[PDB]
Amino acid sequence: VGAXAXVXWXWXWXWX
């Protein structure tokens, strides 16, 4: 949860 892969911004879910 933050940034990278998973939740937050980047890839996976959320934004990015």
Add this chain to the structure above:
Amino acid sequence: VGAXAXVXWXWXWXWX
């Protein structure tokens, strides 16, 4: 996985 809470750097596990 990246930064924040969980895996990576910050809090949880890894570093920080």
